[PDB]
Amino acid sequence: SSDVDSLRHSRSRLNIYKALASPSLIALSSEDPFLTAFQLSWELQELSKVENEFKSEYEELSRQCKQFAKDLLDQTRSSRELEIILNYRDDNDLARLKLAIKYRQKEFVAQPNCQQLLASRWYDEFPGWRRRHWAVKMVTCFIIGLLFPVFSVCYLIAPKSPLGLFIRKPFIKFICHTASYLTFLFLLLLASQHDLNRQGPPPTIVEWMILPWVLGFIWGEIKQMWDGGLQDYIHDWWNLMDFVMNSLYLATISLKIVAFVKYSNPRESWDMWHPTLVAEALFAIANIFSSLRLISLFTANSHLGPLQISLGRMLLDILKFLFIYCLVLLAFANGLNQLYFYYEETKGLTCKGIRCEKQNNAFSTLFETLQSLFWSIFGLINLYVTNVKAQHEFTEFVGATMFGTYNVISLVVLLNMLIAMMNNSYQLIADHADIEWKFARTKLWMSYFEEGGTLPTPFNVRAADNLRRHHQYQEVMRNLVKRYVAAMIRDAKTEEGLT
Amino acid sequence: RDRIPLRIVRAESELSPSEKAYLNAVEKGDYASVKKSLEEAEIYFKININCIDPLGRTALLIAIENENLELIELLLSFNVYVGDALLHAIRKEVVGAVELLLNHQFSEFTPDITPIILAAHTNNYEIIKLLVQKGVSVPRPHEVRCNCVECVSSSDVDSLRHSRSRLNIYKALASPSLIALSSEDPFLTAFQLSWELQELSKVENEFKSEYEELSRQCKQFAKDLLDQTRSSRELEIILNYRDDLARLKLAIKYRQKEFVAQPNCQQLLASRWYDEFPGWRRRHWAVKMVTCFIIGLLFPVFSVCYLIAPKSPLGLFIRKPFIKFICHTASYLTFLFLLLLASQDLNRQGPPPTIVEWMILPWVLGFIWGEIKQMWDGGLQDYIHDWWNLMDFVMNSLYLATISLKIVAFVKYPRESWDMWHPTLVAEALFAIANIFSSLRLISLFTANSHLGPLQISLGRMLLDILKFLFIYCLVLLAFANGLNQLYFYYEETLTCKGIRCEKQNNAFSTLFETLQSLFWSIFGLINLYVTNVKAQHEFTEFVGATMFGTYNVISLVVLLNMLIAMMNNSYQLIADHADIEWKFARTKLWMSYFEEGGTLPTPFNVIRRAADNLRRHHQYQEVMRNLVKRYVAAMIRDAKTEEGLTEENFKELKQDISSFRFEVLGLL
Amino acid sequence: EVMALKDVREVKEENTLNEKLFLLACDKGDYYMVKKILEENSSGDLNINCVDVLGRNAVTITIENENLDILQLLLDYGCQSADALLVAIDSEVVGAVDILLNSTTMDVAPVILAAHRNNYEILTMLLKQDVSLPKPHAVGCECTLCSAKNKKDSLRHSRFRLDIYRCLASPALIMLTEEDPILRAFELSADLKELSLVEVEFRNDYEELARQCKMFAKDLLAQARNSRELEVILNHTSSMNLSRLKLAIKYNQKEFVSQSNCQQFLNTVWFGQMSGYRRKPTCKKIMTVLTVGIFWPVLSLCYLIAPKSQFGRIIHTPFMKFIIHGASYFTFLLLLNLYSLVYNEDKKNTMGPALERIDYLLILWIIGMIWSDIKRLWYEGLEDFLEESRNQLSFVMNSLYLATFALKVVAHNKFHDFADRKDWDAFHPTLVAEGLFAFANVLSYLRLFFMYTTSSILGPLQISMGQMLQDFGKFLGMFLLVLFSFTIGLTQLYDKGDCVGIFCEQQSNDTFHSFIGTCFALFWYIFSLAHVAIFVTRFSYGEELQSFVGAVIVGTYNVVVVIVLTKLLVAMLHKSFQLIANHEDKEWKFARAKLWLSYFDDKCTLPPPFNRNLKQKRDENYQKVMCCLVHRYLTSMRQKMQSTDQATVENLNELRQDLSKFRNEIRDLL
Numbered sequence A: 001s002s003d004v005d006s007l008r009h010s011r012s013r014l015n016i017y018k019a020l021a022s023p024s025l026i027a028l029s030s031e032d033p034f035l036t037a038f039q040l041s042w043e044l045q046e047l048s049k050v051e052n053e054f055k056s057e058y059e060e061l062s063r064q065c066k067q068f069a070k071d072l073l074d075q076t077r078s079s080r081e082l083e084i085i086l087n088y089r090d091d092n093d094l095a096r097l098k099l100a101i102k103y104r105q106k107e108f109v110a111q112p113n114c115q116q117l118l119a120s121r122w123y124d125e126f127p128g129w130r131r132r133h134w135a136v137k138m139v140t141c142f143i144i145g146l147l148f149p150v151f152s153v154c155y156l157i158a159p160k161s162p163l164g165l166f167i168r169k170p171f172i173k174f175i176c177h178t179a180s181y182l183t184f185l186f187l188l189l190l191a192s193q194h195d196l197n198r199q200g201p202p203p204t205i206v207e208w209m210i211l212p213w214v215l216g217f218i219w220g221e222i223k224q225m226w227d228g229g230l231q232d233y234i235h236d237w238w239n240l241m242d243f244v245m246n247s248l249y250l251a252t253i254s255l256k257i258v259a260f261v262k263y264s265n266p267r268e269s270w271d272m273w274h275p276t277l278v279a280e281a282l283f284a285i286a287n288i289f290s291s292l293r294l295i296s297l298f299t300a301n302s303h304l305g306p307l308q309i310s311l312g313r314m315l316l317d318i319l320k321f322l323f324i325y326c327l328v329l330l331a332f333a334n335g336l337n338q339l340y341f342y343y344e345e346t347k348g349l350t351c352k353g354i355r356c357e358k359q360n361n362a363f364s365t366l367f368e369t370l371q372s373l374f375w376s377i378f379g380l381i382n383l384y385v386t387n388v389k390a391q392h393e394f395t396e397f398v399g400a401t402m403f404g405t406y407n408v409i410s411l412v413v414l415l416n417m418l419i420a421m422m423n424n425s426y427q428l429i430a431d432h433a434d435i436e437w438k439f440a441r442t443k444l445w446m447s448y449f450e451e452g453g454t455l456p457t458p459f460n461v462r463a464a465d466n467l468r469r470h471h472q473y474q475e476v477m478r479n480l481v482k483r484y485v486a487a488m489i490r491d492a493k494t495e496e497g498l499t
Numbered sequence B: 001r002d003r004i005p006l007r008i009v010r011a012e013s014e015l016s017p018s019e020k021a022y023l024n025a026v027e028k029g030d031y032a033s034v035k036k037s038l039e040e041a042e043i044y045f046k047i048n049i050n051c052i053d054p055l056g057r058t059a060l061l062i063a064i065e066n067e068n069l070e071l072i073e074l075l076l077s078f079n080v081y082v083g084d085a086l087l088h089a090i091r092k093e094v095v096g097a098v099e100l101l102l103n104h105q106f107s108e109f110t111p112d113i114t115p116i117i118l119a120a121h122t123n124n125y126e127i128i129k130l131l132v133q134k135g136v137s138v139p140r141p142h143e144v145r146c147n148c149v150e151c152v153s154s155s156d157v158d159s160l161r162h163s164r165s166r167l168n169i170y171k172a173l174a175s176p177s178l179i180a181l182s183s184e185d186p187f188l189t190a191f192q193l194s195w196e197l198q199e200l201s202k203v204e205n206e207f208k209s210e211y212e213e214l215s216r217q218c219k220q221f222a223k224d225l226l227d228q229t230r231s232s233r234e235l236e237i238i239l240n241y242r243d244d245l246a247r248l249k250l251a252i253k254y255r256q257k258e259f260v261a262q263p264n265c266q267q268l269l270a271s272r273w274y275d276e277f278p279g280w281r282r283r284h285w286a287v288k289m290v291t292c293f294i295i296g297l298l299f300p301v302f303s304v305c306y307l308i309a310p311k312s313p314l315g316l317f318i319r320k321p322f323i324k325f326i327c328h329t330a331s332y333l334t335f336l337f338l339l340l341l342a343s344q345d346l347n348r349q350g351p352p353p354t355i356v357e358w359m360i361l362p363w364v365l366g367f368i369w370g371e372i373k374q375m376w377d378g379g380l381q382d383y384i385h386d387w388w389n390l391m392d393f394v395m396n397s398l399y400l401a402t403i404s405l406k407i408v409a410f411v412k413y414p415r416e417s418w419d420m421w422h423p424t425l426v427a428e429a430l431f432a433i434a435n436i437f438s439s440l441r442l443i444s445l446f447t448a449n450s451h452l453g454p455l456q457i458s459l460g461r462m463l464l465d466i467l468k469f470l471f472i473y474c475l476v477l478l479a480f481a482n483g484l485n486q487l488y489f490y491y492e493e494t495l496t497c498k499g500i501r502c503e504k505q506n507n508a509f510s511t512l513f514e515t516l517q518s519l520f521w522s523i524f525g526l527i528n529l530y531v532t533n534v535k536a537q538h539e540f541t542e543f544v545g546a547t548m549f550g551t552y553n554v555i556s557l558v559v560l561l562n563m564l565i566a567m568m569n570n571s572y573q574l575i576a577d578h579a580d581i582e583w584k585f586a587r588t589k590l591w592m593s594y595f596e597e598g599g600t601l602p603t604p605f606n607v608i609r610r611a612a613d614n615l616r617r618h619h620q621y622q623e624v625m626r627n628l629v630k631r632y633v634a635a636m637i638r639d640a641k642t643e644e645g646l647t648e649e650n651f652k653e654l655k656q657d658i659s660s661f662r663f664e665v666l667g668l669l
Numbered sequence C: 001e002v003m004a005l006k007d008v009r010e011v012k013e014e015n016t017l018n019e020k021l022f023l024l025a026c027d028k029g030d031y032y033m034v035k036k037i038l039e040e041n042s043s044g045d046l047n048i049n050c051v052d053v054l055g056r057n058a059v060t061i062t063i064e065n066e067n068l069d070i071l072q073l074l075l076d077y078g079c080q081s082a083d084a085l086l087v088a089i090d091s092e093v094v095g096a097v098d099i100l101l102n103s104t105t106m107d108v109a110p111v112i113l114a115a116h117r118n119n120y121e122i123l124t125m126l127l128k129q130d131v132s133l134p135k136p137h138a139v140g141c142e143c144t145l146c147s148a149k150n151k152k153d154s155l156r157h158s159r160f161r162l163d164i165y166r167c168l169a170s171p172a173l174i175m176l177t178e179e180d181p182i183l184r185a186f187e188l189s190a191d192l193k194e195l196s197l198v199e200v201e202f203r204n205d206y207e208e209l210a211r212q213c214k215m216f217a218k219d220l221l222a223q224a225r226n227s228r229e230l231e232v233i234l235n236h237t238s239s240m241n242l243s244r245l246k247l248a249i250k251y252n253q254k255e256f257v258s259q260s261n262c263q264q265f266l267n268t269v270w271f272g273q274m275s276g277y278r279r280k281p282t283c284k285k286i287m288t289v290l291t292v293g294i295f296w297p298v299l300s301l302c303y304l305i306a307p308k309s310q311f312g313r314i315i316h317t318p319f320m321k322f323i324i325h326g327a328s329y330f331t332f333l334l335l336l337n338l339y340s341l342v343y344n345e346d347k348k349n350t351m352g353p354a355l356e357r358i359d360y361l362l363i364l365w366i367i368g369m370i371w372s373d374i375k376r377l378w379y380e381g382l383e384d385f386l387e388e389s390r391n392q393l394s395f396v397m398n399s400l401y402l403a404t405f406a407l408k409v410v411a412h413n414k415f416h417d418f419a420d421r422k423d424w425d426a427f428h429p430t431l432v433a434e435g436l437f438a439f440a441n442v443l444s445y446l447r448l449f450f451m452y453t454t455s456s457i458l459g460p461l462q463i464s465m466g467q468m469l470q471d472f473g474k475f476l477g478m479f480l481l482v483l484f485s486f487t488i489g490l491t492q493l494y495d496k497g498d499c500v501g502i503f504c505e506q507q508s509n510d511t512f513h514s515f516i517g518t519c520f521a522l523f524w525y526i527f528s529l530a531h532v533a534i535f536v537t538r539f540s541y542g543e544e545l546q547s548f549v550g551a552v553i554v555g556t557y558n559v560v561v562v563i564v565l566t567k568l569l570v571a572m573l574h575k576s577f578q579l580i581a582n583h584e585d586k587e588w589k590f591a592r593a594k595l596w597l598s599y600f601d602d603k604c605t606l607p608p609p610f611n612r613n614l615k616q617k618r619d620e621n622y623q624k625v626m627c628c629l630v631h632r633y634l635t636s637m638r639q640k641m642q643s644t645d646q647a648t649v650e651n652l653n654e655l656r657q658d659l660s661k662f663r664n665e666i667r668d669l670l
C-alpha cells in the first residue's frame, strides 16, 4: 500500500486513529475505557515518534486521549468508586494507578481525588499529620530519623510487633531511608576527616562500616533492576547516577583489595598510576555522586519539588546547547593546536601546561588546547599564554585573534543565547510544573508502597472473585460513562462562541 | 479479524417510537401533541409520565432546559415525578424554579448538593433570594484544623465525599450574592472568608487552586463592594467602623491588598498623610526637596517642642504623619552619619571616644526600646512576619553584643600581639556587621517614594525563590566540596599563609572548610588554577581534581546561574502585573505606622451614652451597607447580561421559542 | 465658566415629516407604507435621496438590512444609485449585487472591492462580464507615467497601487483568472515582499498581503488527496526534476514547504528505496548510518567502476549520498587532526618543508572541494550561492587553503635553508602559510555546523541561533562605536607616557600608549573575568590625577559595557527568541528541505575526494488536478466561513428587521 500510494495510506491511518481516539466512541463501545485511553495514547505517541510528518496530529490525539481519561476520572463522586477504579487489574494493589504511571498519564495521576487517596495511603495511620504545626513536624521527623535502626531491627526480629509494623508505614519508611542516606553521607564526610602506607588497610573507625553499606546499595540496585525490568531503570536518570556511583564504589573496593594483596615508601615517590591513588580518586568521584543523589529527595517537599522538576526538564536543553558549544570548542581547539604546536618547549621547566603559576604550553597539544579553551569561559587562562618565546609577531597576533574570537563566540554570543533560550524554556515549562511534580512525587510515593525493600541500606543486606470484580468495575464504568456523557452534553451546549 | 467490530457495551432499555415521538413533541414545542400524549398516558397505554431517556433526560428536564414555562406547568399539572429537576432549573437559571418550589437512579449532581448550595454556586441573586425567602440553611463547616469525631468518621467512611461536600459548602458561602443578601457585615464576612479559604488552601494540598480562587473571589467582591462608594462620608463611615480607621486596619490584617490600593482609600490615606497641607503634591520637586531638607535639619527642635509642649502649633507640626516620617528619616540619617564618622589602637581596653561614639549610644538604646515596645503591642507573629523587623532585631542584638564586649574589655583588659579572639576585635567586627545592617535598613524607606517603591517591593518579593535556589546550590556545593576534600586532603602541606587568601594560593582543598571557601570563591573567578596541583608528580590525581573543579564550575556558572536567571525572569514577569497593588499596600502599612499618636518622638528622644453611640454607628453602617449592596447588585446585574456572550443554549432557546410560536399559529389555523 | 456645546457642522436636515417616516420605515421593513411613501414620491411630496444622521440614503439603509424585495421596489421607482453597488458588495450579499447589475475612496472599482472582501460568488458573477483591471507598474518603474500621477497626488497613487495589489492578492481572483494559481501565488508573494521592502511607509499592508498569498498557496497544497496528484503538482514545469518544489524553495515559501503532505513527499523522495529505515528501531538506524559511512570510499569507487548496477544504486539514494558526503568531510577533518601528529618528525625547523603524504592528501581533498564549489557556481546561479552562509564560509576556507598551499610551494622553491625557528622573521612565507592553515582549519571544522539541519533535535535550535545572529550584528555596531569612543579617550589621555602590551606576565602601562593597543585592552574588558588588570591604568611616574582619570574612564567603560550593554543584549535576545520560537519548526523544515534538495540532484553524486505531445499531456493533467484542488479548496473554505465565523451585531439587526417585517405583514393581513 505504501509503494502504491503513501499519502493515501497515511491519511487513511490518521483518519482511523482519529476515529478510534474520540471520547464518544471509547465511552460507547469500549469494554475498559481507561485501558483503551491509556493504550491509545501510547500508540499515538509512538506514531508521532515514527511519523515525523503529522506529528502534531498524533500528539493532539494523544493529548485528547489523556484529557478524556482525566475527565472520566473526574466523574468519581465516591471513595469506593475511586478505590474500585485504581485497584482494578485485568487479570489494595493500585494496579491501574501503576499502569497509568507506566503509560505516562500525568494529568490522570495528578488529579486531586487520587492525590488524596495516595496521600491517605502515604500517611498510614497518621491522624492529623497534614494539619500539624511545621516545627512539630520537623521535630517528629528528626525523632524518627534518629530511630531508624531500632525500627529496622524490630522489623528484623518481629514484623508482627507494632514496633515492627511502624516501619510498614510508607512515610516512616521514607523517613528512615533518608536518615540512613544522611548517616551514609556523614560517614563519607568523616572519611576525609582525621599517609605513607602503600598497602593501607581500611580504617575501622569509618571505612570498615562503609563496605556493608556499599553491598546494601548494590543489592538494592540489583533487586530494583530485577523487579521492574531494565527499560524503566534506564528511563530514570537517578537510577543511572546510582549505577555509576555503585560501579565506582565497586572499582574502589577492587583497587583497594588489589593494593592490599599486591604492591605492598613515601607518598611523593609513588607511581602516577598507583592503584591506591586511583582508588582514592574513584572514591572521591563516588562521594560526589552519592552526595549529589540528595537532590532526588527534593521531590517529596512541596516547595523545592517543582523547582527541581523544572531544572531536570531544562537539563535536556542544557545538553542540546552543550553539543553546539562542544563543536565550537573542537573547531577552535584544532585551529589553535595547528597554529601553536610548532612552539612547544621543555626548557627544564617543572611545569608544562596551564595548571600552575606560570602558564605555558597552553596550545602545544590538542588535550592542552582543549583544557585551555575550556578554562577560558571562567577566565582562569591569562593572556600571555598566546605568546611564544620567538619574535614572531604575526603568529602571536593570529593566536590572540583566534583566542579573542573563541572568547567572543562563547561568552558574548553562546552564553547569552543560552540564557535567552532557557528563559523561554522555563517560561514554557512553568505552566505545567505542578502536574509533573505531582507525577514524580507519586512515583516516589509508590516506590515505598510495596512490601519488598522495606529495610534501610545497612540492614537490607479465584474465578468467582474475578467475575465479581469485573461486574463491580463494569457498574462503576457505567456510572462514570453516564456522568461523563451528561457533562459532555452540558459543557457542549454552553460553548461561549456562537457561529 | 482485520476489522474492529463496533458494538454498544453499555446498552439501555431505549425508548418506543411513540415515546420517542412524545419526547420530540416535548423538544419542538407541540403543546397540542404533548397534551394529547399526556391524555393518552392517563389511560393505560405505552407512554408513561415518568419516562427516562437513555441520556437521563426526563420530559420535565428537557422542558426545563428549553425555557418553556407552559410545558413545565403542564407536566406538574399531571403529577409528573419530580426528582432533581429543581436543581436543573437552578443550574439553568430558569424562572420556573418558582413553579418547581410550589409544586407540592442517575443524577447529574453530587448528592451533597442542595438547592441553596447550587443556587449560590450559580451566583444568581434572584434564585438565592427566592430560596432564602422560602427558608434554607447551609450546614456550618468545622474549623480548618479540627479533629472532632464527626470529621474523622466521615473521612474514614468517604474522604472524597467529605472533601467535595466541604468544598461545595465553602463555594456556596463565598459567593458574592449570598454574602450581599444573608450576611450582617459583608466586608467582615468577605475578609474572614478569604482568610479561612487561604488557610484551607494551605491545609488541603489537593483542591488548593479551588480554595485560592475562592479567596481571590472574596477579595475581589470586597474590592467591588468598596468601589460603589459615592461620597467621602460613606467612605469614612465604612473605614472607621468597629464592632481611627479600624476597618482599614482589619483589611491590612487580613491581607486584603485589593480593598486597600483603591483610589478612594488611597485618597483618604493621602488626605490623612499630608494633613493640613493644601496642595503639597501640586508643587515643583525642587521646592519639595528644599523644604524636606529644611524639616530634616530641624528635627531636634520639633522633637524638643513635642517633649515640652504638645499643644503648641510647633508641637502639633510634628504630629503630622508626613512631618514625623521626615523627622524619623532625618534621625536615622544622622545616626548613619555618626556611624560613618565612627568608621573614620594599641590599647587592649577601648574606651568610647569622647565625641563620636558617646552620642551614638542614645540611638542604640532608642532602637532597642522601640523594638521592645513594638514587640509588646500587636504580638510576636507580626514581628516575625516582617523581614525588616528581623533585620533590625539582628542589628540591635549585634549592637548590644558590642556594648557588652566593650564593657567587658574595659573592666577586664600593641595591637599586633593580641589573641585573635580578643573582645575588642570581636566588638569591632560585630560593630562593622551592625553598621552594614543599619545602613542596609535604608531600603525600607524606598516604599514612600513612587519610583523606587514598586521596584523595591518586587525585588523583596522574589527573595523566597532566591532562598530555594540557594538551597539547591548549597546542596551542589556540599557535594563537590566533599569530593574535592576527599581527593585532596592527602596532600596537605604546612609557609606563613595557608589558604586561598594570599598571593600564592595553596591548600585550597586540604580542609573541608577551605574546600567550601575555595568552591564559593570560584563563582567570581577569585580562585586560580594552580590550587589543583600537588607537590608530588601525581598527574592523575591532579587531572581528576581539576576535572572536579571544571565540572563544578560548569554546573554552578553555566547551568545553575542561567537556571537562576530564567527563574528570576519567570518570577518577575509573574509579579510585575500586581506591582502597584503590593507597593500601595506596603506604603499604606508604612503610613499607618506613623498615623498613630504613640511613638511620635524619634529614637534619640523616644526613651525620654456608649450604647447609644454604638447603636447610632451600627445604624449608620447598616444604611451605608444597604446602599452599597443595592449599588453592587445593580452593577453586577448590568455587568452580568453584557459580558457573558451567547452560547449555543440561547440559540436552542431561540429555535424552541420560534418553533413553539409556529406551532401555536398552526394550532390557531 | 461653562463651555456651551453647539453643533459646529450641520449633517442632518429634518425638513418635512415624510422623509423621517421614510427613513424609519426603511430600517423596519414596513413594505406597504414604504410603497405608499414611494407613490407620494411619484406624486412629488419628498426627495428620494434623503440624508439621515448617519449620512446613509434609503438604498444604503435597505442594503445594510439585506432586504431584496424593498430594494427592488426602490430601484423600480428610479432611485439614485450613487455607488450603491459598492455598498452592496461590501455587505457581501449575492442578491443585492446581482440586482444592482441588472464613502469609498474613488480609486476602487466593483471588481477591486469584490476582491477586497474576498467573496467568491460575487467575484464569479462580476467576472461573467468582461472586466479588466489596470496593470500596476514594476517596483523599479520610474517612467513619465509614474512621475506625473505622483506629483499630482502621491497619496492617491500609493493607495491606488495598494488597492490594485490587494485585489490581485485575493485568493478567489487567483482561482478565477489564472492558469496556474500556485505560480501566481508564488510570484505575487515575492512581488509583495519586494514592494514592502521598497515602500517603507506601507510595508505592513504589503507584508500581510504576501503572508496571505503564502497561506493561500499552503492551503491550496493541503487539499491534495492522493500522492499521484501530489507528484503531478510538485513536478510541474512552467515551460523527477521537482521544478515546482524548487520554485517554492526559491520564492521563500516556508509555509508551502513545511506542509505535512510536502514534507511526507520529501521524506519519501529522500529515503529512496530504503523506506523501512523510518520504521526501523534506533539501534538499526545508527548501525545503518555507521555501515554506510565506514565503507564510503568502497561505494564511491564501485559507483565509479559500474554506475548502472545495484552497488551504484545505493549511493544514488540522497540519504546515503548525504551520509557518504558527511563521512567524506569527517575523514577530511580526521586528516586535518592527524596533520599535527604526523608533522612531529623534526619538520618544525625547516624553512620550506617538503610536502608529506598528508599534504598531498589535503591538496587533493581541497582541489576536489574547489571543483565541487565551481560546479555549484556553474549550475545554480551566483547571488543565491552568496545568500547561504555555508557557501560563503566554504569559499573563504578554500581561498585560505589555496593561499596556504601557494605560500607553501613558494617557500619550498625559494626558502630552503635549514635553520632554527627562533631566528626567522615575523612575515616569513612559511609562518603566514601556517597561520592561514590554522584559519582554514577553524573554518573547516566550523563548516560542520550545517549538518545539524537534518537532525530533528539539533536542527531548530541551530536555525534559531542563525536567525538571531542579526541581533548580535545590530548591537555589535553600537558596541563598536562605544569602544571606539573610549579608545579615543584613553589613547588621548595615556599617549604622554622586552614584552610590551597586555600579552605579558606583567601587563605594563604601555597598553594604552597606542590606538590598536587601547582597542586590545578594552576588548579584553568585556568578559569581566580579570583578563586585563586595573594596574595597567597607573602611570609609570606617579601622576595621580591622570592615573585616577584613566581609572575612572576604564570603570565607566566597564559599567557601560558589562552592566548595561550585555544585559541589554540579553533582553533583545529574550525578545528575539520569544518571537523566533513560535515558527522555529517551519524554518527548520524549510532549511532541511533546502539541504535535501541540494542532494536530490544527480549532477553532484560523488563525494569531494573522488570527483510536444508530452507537454500538452502534462498541461492537461496539471489543469485537471488544479481544477480538483480549486473545487476542494472552495468547498473547504466556504465550510470554514460558515462554521468558524462568529456572529455580529449586524446579524442581530437583520433578525430584528425580519421579525419586524413579519410583524408588519401580520398587521396588514389581519
Ligand SMILES: CCCCCCCCCCCCCCCC(=O)OC[C@H](COP(=O)(O)O)OC(=O)CCCCCCCCCCCCCCC
Residues within 6 Å of the ligand: A315, A318, A322, A325, A326, A370, A371, A372, A374, A377, A410, A411, A414, A415, A418, B476, B542, B543, B544, B546, B547, B548, B549, B550, B551, B552, B554, B555, B558, B559
Ligand atoms: C546538579 C544537577 C544539575 C546539573 C546536572 C549536570 C549538568 C551539567 C553537566 C556538565 C558535565 C561536565 C562537562 C565537562 C566539564 C569538565 O569537567 O571538563 C574538564 C576538562 C578540563 O580538564 P582539566 O580541568 O584537568 O584541565 O575539560 C576538557 O577536558 C576539555 C574537553 C572537554 C570539554 C567539555 C566541555 C563541555 C561543555 C562545558 C562548558 C559549557 C560552557 C558553554 C559556554 C557557552
Ligand SMILES: CCCCCCCCCCCCCCCC(=O)OC[C@H](COP(=O)(O)O)OC(=O)CCCCCCCCCCCCCCC
Residues within 6 Å of the ligand: A328, A397, A400, A401, A402, A403, A404, A405, A408, A409, A412, A413, C446, C449, C469, C476, C479, C519, C520, C521, C523, C524, C526, C561, C562, C565, C566, C569
Ligand atoms: C559558527 C557559529 C558560531 C556562533 C556565531 C558566531 C557569530 C560571529 C561572532 C562575532 C564575530 C567574531 C568575533 C569578532 C571579535 C574579534 O574577532 O576580536 C578579536 C580581536 C582580538 O585581538 P587581541 O587578542 O590582539 O586583543 O579583537 C581586536 O582585534 C580588538 C579590536 C577590534 C575589537 C572588535 C570587538 C568586536 C565586539 C565583540 C564583543 C562584543 C561584545 C558585546 C557585548 C557587550
Ligand SMILES: CCCCCCCCCCCCCCCC(=O)OC[C@H](COP(=O)(O)O)OC(=O)CCCCCCCCCCCCCCC
Residues within 6 Å of the ligand: C482, C548, C551, C552, C553, C555, C556, C559, C560, C563, C564, C565
Ligand atoms: C552608551 C549607551 C549605554 C550606556 C548609557 C549610560 C548608562 C551607564 C552610565 C554609567 C555612568 C558611570 C557609572 C559609574 C562608573 C564610576 O563611577 O567609576 C568611577 C569610580 C572608579 O574609580 P577607580 O577606577 O579610580 O577605582 O567609581 C568609584 O569611585 C567608586 C564609588 C562610585 C561607584 C559608582 C557605581 C555606580 C553604579 C555602577 C555599577 C552598577 C553595578 C550594578 C550591579 C547589579
Ligand SMILES: CC(C)CCC[C@@H](C)[C@H]1CC[C@H]2[C@@H]3CC=C4C[C@@H](OC(=O)CCC(=O)O)CC[C@]4(C)[C@H]3CC[C@]12C
Residues within 6 Å of the ligand: A178, A182, A185, A186, A294, A297, A298, A300, A301, A302, B475
Ligand atoms: C551533610 C548531610 C548530613 C546532608 C545535609 C543536608 C540534609 C540534612 C538535608 C538536605 C536536603 C534535605 C531534604 C529535603 C526535602 C525533604 C522533604 C521533606 O519531607 C517531606 O516533604 C515529606 C513528604 C510530605 O511531607 O508530603 C523534609 C525531609 C527531606 C527529605 C529533607 C531531609 C534533610 C535533607 C536531606
Ligand SMILES: CC(C)CCC[C@@H](C)[C@H]1CC[C@H]2[C@@H]3CC=C4C[C@@H](OC(=O)CCC(=O)O)CC[C@]4(C)[C@H]3CC[C@]12C
Residues within 6 Å of the ligand: B329, B333, B336, B337, B340, B442, B445, B446, B448, B449, B450
Ligand atoms: C550616607 C548617608 C547620609 C545616606 C545617604 C543617602 C540618603 C541621603 C538617602 C538614601 C535614600 C533616601 C530616601 C529615599 C526615598 C525617600 C522618599 C521620599 O519621600 C517621599 O516620597 C514621601 C512621601 C510622598 O512624597 O508621597 C524622599 C525621602 C526619602 C525617605 C529619602 C531620604 C534620603 C535617603 C535616605
Ligand SMILES: [Ca+2]
Residues within 6 Å of the ligand: A221, A224, A238, A239, A242
Ligand atoms: Ca535506584
Ligand SMILES: [Ca+2]
Residues within 6 Å of the ligand: B371, B374, B388, B389, B392
Ligand atoms: Ca522595627
Ligand SMILES: [Zn+2]
Residues within 6 Å of the ligand: B142, B143, B146, B147, B148, B150, B151
Ligand atoms: Zn470537625
Ligand SMILES: [Zn+2]
Residues within 6 Å of the ligand: C137, C141, C142, C143, C144, C145, C146
Ligand atoms: Zn511606469
